[PDB]
Design a protein around this nucleic acid. Structure first.
Lengths: 227, 197, 188, 170
RNA sequence: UUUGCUCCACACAAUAUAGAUGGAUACGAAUAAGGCGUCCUUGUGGCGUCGCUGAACCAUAGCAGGCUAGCAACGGUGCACUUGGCGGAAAGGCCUUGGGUGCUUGCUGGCGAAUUGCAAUGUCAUUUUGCGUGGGGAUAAAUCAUUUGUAUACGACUUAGA
RNA sequence: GCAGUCAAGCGUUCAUAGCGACAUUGCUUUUUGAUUCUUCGAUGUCGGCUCUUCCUAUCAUACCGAAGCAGAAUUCGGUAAGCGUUGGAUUGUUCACCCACUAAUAGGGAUACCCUACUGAU
RNA sequence: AAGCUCGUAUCAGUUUUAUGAGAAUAUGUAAGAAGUCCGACAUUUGAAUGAAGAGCUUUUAGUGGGCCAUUUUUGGUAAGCAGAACUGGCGAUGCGGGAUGAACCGAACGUAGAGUUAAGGUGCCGGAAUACACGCUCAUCAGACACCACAAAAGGUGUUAGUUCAUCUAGACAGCCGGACGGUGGCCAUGGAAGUCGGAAUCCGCUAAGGAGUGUGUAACAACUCACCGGCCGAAUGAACUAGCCCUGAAAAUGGAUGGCGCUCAAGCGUGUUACCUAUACUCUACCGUCAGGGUUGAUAUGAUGCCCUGACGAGUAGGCAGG
RNA sequence: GAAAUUGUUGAAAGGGAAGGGCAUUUGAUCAGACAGGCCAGCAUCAGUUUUGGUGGCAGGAUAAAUCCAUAGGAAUGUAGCUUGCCUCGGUAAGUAUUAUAGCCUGUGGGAAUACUGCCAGCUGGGACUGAGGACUGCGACGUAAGUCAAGGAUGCUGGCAUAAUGGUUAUAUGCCGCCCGUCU
């Protein structure tokens, strides 16, 4: 006895199971023979509408995501076992979160398109602060007239985990002293990432990178090491 | 085997010491007990305090001056839970307990004398580790023995004087041991070495 | 079920020293010294070399094992007190009645005095313990700073005052005033 | 008691127009021959509708185990009728012989479920020659290699009552 | 109210043991830790070593322990003296100087043992008291009666009186 | 109370041979506080004091938690028995039920000189 | 008790064979000369086992108050309750144990010695082990004996042994971060209701996954989290159910009890092995006493109800008999 | 000139009980016989009974086992080899089936031992008992006369010859004991 009671819900959602795992393991190998190229794209932090955008952009190409070892199940890690030849070498290099792209139009347009494709996302970059006065949705990035105050419910959280001094008068939120939120040229603390989320500041550049490619009729590994 | 036996009541257990003490009494080995405030009992402090309070509330309904005496001090607790083990109402009982002499600390003359123990009652042996116990000095202090800070002091004095004794005795036994070592490898010693000495 | 043995490890940096006789532990390092008694919990230690040390239990039950992780949590806090030292921080707040706050050293006791809680005349002393220092806050209004090496000591002292300034007979849904902690972090 | 293993083979009856009913054996655990025979009839009645008068022993054989020296991690299936209704079990043992293993097991059931010997059917006892088929942990933890452990705090036992030493463990 | 009362030794008497018949042989503190010898940087230090029961240690031979002889060593030990210490928790004992006084089984000799008749606890110690011993030491209260009354059932408690 | 529903489980095995956990629905003397003065065979001997102690399941006095607690006081609950719980009005009757105070005016149980116990005394 | 007859005698609170009545249990009868044939058939003459005897006539004393336990059977909540029937214990009956007892376990008695056991027990009171061995349990009233103060249902983030389902180095669970999209602010509802004041419904695209959306909350919106997925770390882990110990269920009031002391790797609960303790019970032995079977007037001598040999047995109120 | 009851003396005991029962101690008290009475011990034998060590035997799977030879296998993987670092061996894997350790299973071989049970096999220690009273018989030793553990114990020796053992009796001590008779 004396257990940690696992908390239960009554959500209408259901768990994934293994049927999805076998499904994607089948569909990867389904894409393999039919398509010519197999591109590897290293990407760790991705957004849902952005993935919707790039999904609807390239219907000629097929982008798929899944667990690393399930992709290794589909393609086959060793040269001794694999769907087809000269893929085991690409099986080794894929270390992090990767999305697999299958193209049949051109090798150069693929690598150059995403080096052309750059966006603005969160750091997870320049520095920022707040003034020692009333605080706003941006927190002084914009004029205070059009800037609306933050809602008072989340002010305790700012006190708690962002550690910022604060005290709530009538509905305008206020402080006594300013605080530089972060500095330039260093990967951010979690408090810093979360406060730029709360402000809504995607100050970080974003490029999806490519590390290699394949081509069937050549049956060779294309090593394209770019960020 | 001896005329007299002198028990240290340290790290010991009340029931299991009372038992052997009783039998050695009624077979006739005069016994003295000391350091009974260093004694110990199984079970935690709160258990033993409630066992004591349930006794504490029991007196004669009409006149307490004749009814049960709720003795406080530890030697008298041990004596209580020993006279329960012997027939004090008889004369064999009273002539047992004219052989028992129970004290706190170690008063004289016994401090100069050989303290012993009883292995089949010790805490460390006859209990499992990872388990509680209660110090009787603390319990008596918690139910109105008003003396605990004093036996502490006199125990300190005896401890220091005995350590100063122990230095002398250690030095002297070092001397005689060195002498007997130099007495070794001599045929008068080698014969004894053959015969087990 | 008598897991035949179980172990945790305490990993330690170079410059700090530790020392343990039977269960009597000491920690000496950059910030200074700490010490604690562990004679009540019946566990065993063994060193491998000079950064790392293995607590261990032999032939133990569930309670006898659940001591162990708690000991690990104790000893890391002990060590980090000597490496970093710990820092707490409070704010002494009010709606209408400004609290007076004061350190006083009477008999070297280093008491903490407070007054003017909703206009009440009573003085309320909170003493200060060994090896813990107090600092009234610089450049932060209505703020107080704690510093020490012993987490248990500083936290107990922080708890004492916020119990001693406790409101009674009244509704905290309307009344607000009370001293609480901003956060609990290291010195460094 | 100090248990033993026993082969018992029984034969329903010599009868005319059914000579030599086929045969019926059991592997049986007991201290002596008689309790084996009685348990044999007790279980044999359960299997089908025969009796001691409609039963007879062919013969028995005491069974000395083949490898006393060999440690053998056994695993055993048991059914028993508790205070409440019946239920089944699988257990796992590291002991030497079947006889010492079950002698420990009956004590263990006697402790943990107040199992008296009458209401406890040995379904089967077996050996587990390889690893990777043990499920439990209170056997598994004795099997790693280079295994060592201490015996702290040996409770010595003196015959004498007094002693003059204020003793030490080790 | 006859010379009673005490303490030094001692001869005899009694009166009995909750039960002697080599030794009540001293550290403390922990026990999932420690003792002892030793080393130096004095440490919660190192090196070595020990435990598993004191089935030990110390003592121990003489007629229930004699008379004597030496040999060798400066010791051990009893007895009464003597010196200076220590200890109040229920010390009432534990040290130490000085010599005197013996015995020495540390080694080697001589003499005697009988007859309690094959054993019969085969009496050895210690409590108390007394009467006698010859040697020092000191030579009072209380109660009653009486009176007061801070008290008072009667007793008692408190006072006073050469 | 009775009668269903829901039905964790039980039953050589089981819905349906049958029980059954907890909730729910059925009015049971009146949907707009209008009231109704309903005491309808109280069939037993205690009743009422002097006065001691004990139990708590506390009525206030302690300390506490939560409650729309802005306060005062109140509503509940918890540890709590250390200390306290009244003066009158009315019947042979305990049945019945008011006035006012106080912080409250909680509920319960338990001839005699003779030997014993108790209070005191040599 | 007095006679008469038998004497190995009819028998049995009994089984077995056989067969009935009404499946077992229980219950009835047969198991031979007193039978078989028209003078013929003796102890292998008709199963087992045991027999200080069996039957017939006459007569005499005391007795004819019930309780409790098991079983069949009727009622109910059931009693120190009632309706029926068989058997047993009591009463008349001691003794060891149950701490003590009108009902439980054991066991029925001369006086004594030795021995050995029963039921119950071996921390001390108390004779006997702080024996050995496997486990469990830590109670702010632990528990310590069957029927001689019991409660379940259930509750329990205390502990143990399990069963069955599940996941898992093709990466199990914990923990950190991100993702957690549209028509959509879905429909009327409203003054305002946009994933959640609220009723109906409740779907599809992309999807690794994302519900017309569990909670946080604005007058509305907004913002945050898990449930749903992926990452970084790497081995096991989760759910339901069961049953033993434990806590709760499970309370009164003079001060109060496992019998007291007290006990917690027990002196407790569950199991086993040996050893040990002692009762008027068992064995052996001396003596007494009765009873029964045997021998014994014979010279010399003293008792014929006497003497001798052997064996078994001994409780006992009312009542009876004999000697004193 | 009894008893209740009462006093004095002598002895003894005594903390909320007394009296009684079994055994004994202490104290008081006491009868009997030595001219063969009392208490004890040693040896041998008999009966009952207890407790040790040792010896010989039969069994089961003619024990299983161990041990020896033998084929095969695997690991909680031994040597060896290989790899990553790296204090230069030390981890982690992978190999490797005796190699620079060994184990398991299966077969075969010849013994012992335990466990159980049997001895009209030996031998020792300790306690209680001593019944009965010319011989008779079943018996053993033997050639034998005769001997003997053979239908119930004798021999040798010691001391005392007295309140020493014992008896009575008050008392203490361990343990036990519910107040008598009668109706119910």
């Amino acid at each position: 006895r004396s257990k940690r009671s696992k908390l239960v819900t009554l959500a209408q959602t259901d768990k994934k199971g293994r049927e999805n795992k076998e499904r994607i393991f089948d569909e990867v190998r389904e894409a393999l023979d039919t398509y010519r190229y197999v591109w590897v794209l290293h990407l760790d932090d991705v957004r849902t509408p952005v993935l919707q955008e790039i999904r609807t952009s390239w219907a000629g190409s097929k982008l798929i995501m899944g667990k690393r070892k399930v992709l290794q199940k589909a393609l086959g890690e060793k040269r001794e076992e694999e769907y087809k030849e000269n893929l085991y070498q690409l099986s080794k290099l894929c270390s992090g979160v990767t999305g697999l792209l299958f193209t049949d139009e051109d090798v150069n347009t693929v690598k150059e398109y995403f080096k052309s494709y750059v966006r603005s996302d969160y750091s997870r970059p320049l520095t920022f602060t707040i003034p020692e006065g009333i605080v706003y949705s941006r927190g002084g990035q914009i004029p205070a007239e059009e800037d609306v105050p933050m809602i008072h419910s989340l002010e305790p959280t700012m006190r708690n985990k962002f550690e910022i001094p604060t005290k709530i008068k009538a509905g305008k939120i206020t402080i006594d002293s300013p605080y530089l939120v972060c500095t330039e040229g260093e990967k951010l603390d979690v408090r810093q990432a979360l406060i730029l989320k709360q402000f809504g500041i995607a100050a970080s550049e974003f490029k999806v990178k490519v590390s290699a490619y394949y081509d069937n009729d050549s049956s060779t590994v294309e090593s394209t090491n770019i960020n | 085997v001896e005329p007299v036996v002198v028990i240290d009541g340290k790290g010991h257990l009340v029931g299991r010491l009372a038992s052997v003490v009783a039998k050695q009494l009624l077979n006739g080995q005069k016994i003295v007990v000391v350091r009974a405030e260093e004694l110990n009992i199984s079970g935690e402090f709160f258990r033993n305090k409630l066992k004591y309070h349930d006794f504490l509330r029991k007196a004669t309904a009409f006149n307490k001056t004749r009814g049960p005496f709720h003795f406080r001090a530890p030697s008298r607790i041990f004596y209580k839970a020993l006279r329960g083990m012997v027939s004090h109402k008889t004369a064999r009982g009273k002539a047992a307990l004219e052989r028992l002499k129970v004290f706190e600390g170690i008063p004289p003359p016994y401090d100069k004398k050989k303290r012993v123990v009883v292995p089949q009652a010790l805490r460390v042996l006859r209990l499992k580790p990872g388990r509680k116990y209660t110090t009787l000095g603390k319990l008596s202090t918690s139910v109105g023995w008003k003396y605990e800070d004093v036996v502490a002091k006199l125990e300190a004095k005896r401890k220091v004087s005995s350590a100063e004794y122990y230095a002398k005795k250690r030095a002297f036994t070092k001397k005689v041991a060195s002498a007997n070592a130099t007495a070794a490898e001599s045929d008068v010693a080698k014969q004894l070495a053959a015969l087990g000495y | 079920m008598k897991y035949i043995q179980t172990e945790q490890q305490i990993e330690v940096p170079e410059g700090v020293t530790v020392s343990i006789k039977s269960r009597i532990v000491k920690v000496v390092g950059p910030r200074g010294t700490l010490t604690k008694n562990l004679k009540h919990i019946d566990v065993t230690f063994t060193k491998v070399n000079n950064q790392l040390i293995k607590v261990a239990v032999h032939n133990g039950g569930r309670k006898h094992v659940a001591a162990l992780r708690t000991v690990k949590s104790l000893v890391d806090n002990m060590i980090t007190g000597v490496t970093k030292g710990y820092k707490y921080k409070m704010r002494y707040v009010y709606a209408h009645f400004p609290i007076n706050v004061n350190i006083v050293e009477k008999d070297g006791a280093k008491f903490i005095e407070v007054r003017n809680f909703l206009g009440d005349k009573k003085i309320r002393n909170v003493p200060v313990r060994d090896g813990v220092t107090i600092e009234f806050s610089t450049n932060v209004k209505d703020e107080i700073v704690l510093s020490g090496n012993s987490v248990e000591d500083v936290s107990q002292n922080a708890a004492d005052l916020q119990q001693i300034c406790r409101v009674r007979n009244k509704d905290i849904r309307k009344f607000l005033d009370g001293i609480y902690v901003s956060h609990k972090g290291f010195i460094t | 008691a100090h248990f033993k293993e026993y082969q018992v083979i029984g034969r329903r009856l010599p009868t005319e127009s059914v000579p030599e009913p086929k045969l019926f054996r059991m592997r049986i655990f007991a201290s002596n021959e008689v309790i084996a025979k009685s348990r044999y009839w007790y279980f044999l009645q359960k299997l089908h509708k025969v009796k001691k008068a409609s039963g007879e022993i062919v013969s028995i054989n005491q069974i000395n185990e083949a490898h006393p020296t060999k440690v053998k991690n056994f695993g055993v299936w048991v059914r028993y009728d508790s205070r409440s209704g019946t239920h089944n079990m699988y257990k796992e043992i590291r002991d030497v012989s079947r006889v010492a293993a079950v002698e420990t097991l009956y004590q263990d059931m006697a402790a943990r479920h107040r199992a008296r010997f009458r209401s406890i059917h040995i379904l089967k006892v077996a050996e587990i020659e390889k690893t990777a088929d043990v499920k439990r942990q209170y056997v598994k933890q004795f099997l790693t290699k280079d295994l060592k452990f201490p015996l702290p705090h040996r409770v010595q036992k003196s015959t004498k009552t007094f002693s003059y030493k204020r003793p030490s463990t080790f």
